[PDB]
């Protein structure tokens with residue numbers, strides 16, 4: 311996250327770190343045994359780390375649970391990033407508490423102008439590299455479809471939305487991928503792609519979760 315703030319330990323209780331020897335992506339806990347992330351975060355050997363603040367220090371609220379299965383969206387296209395969403399099932403249910411909690415799926419899609427919370431352990435610099443140990447946060451509005459398409463000609467599908475600031479300076483970044491965009495207490499986005507980080511006229515692009523609620527629910531119901 312570039313241009314954000316330190317969230318505070320366990321203040322984003324649905325945020326998970328996906329670990330394969332190191333943090334490589336975010337995700338969102340949506341019930342005791344399932345995480346939503348980005349399809350472009352797929353790999354084998356995933357351990358889900360819940361209850362994290364500093365990802366390099368055991369601070370006492372962590373739960374580390376291996377994935378038992380991963381399900382990339384049927385229609386994911388890795389060239390266009392259309393349908394950039396993946397479900398991960400945990401081998402055992404997480405113990406839910408104030409510090410480790412699921413985030414509700416949306417009942418309705420969110421509108422441009424809605425303020426959301428984006429979070430992750432990604433790079434905090436738009437030029438160069440500095441990766442934080444503790445979770446960072448950014449408050450950002452959803453942008454109109456028109457301005458999203460103007461920023462990225464030929465690239466925005468009905469399964470994507472932009473959020474952030476056209477003036478630059480505030481955005482998600484490398485290592486935030488797969489993490490949450492939460493608006494009014496519902497998971498409306500997944501950190502997906504952009505152009506650099508925090509550049510003028512290049513807002514972040516996010517997977518539009520409301521389009522996937524039926525798929526998520528029916529996948530969970532049979533897996």
Ligand SMILES: N=C(N)N1CCCCC1
Pocket residue numbers: 481482483484485486487501502503504505506507508513514515
């Ligand atoms: N929001 C931006 N700029 N992103 C998404 C996360 C990876 C780097 C590109």
Ligand SMILES: [Ca+2]
Pocket residue numbers: 362363364365366367368369372
């Ligand atoms: Ca930790």
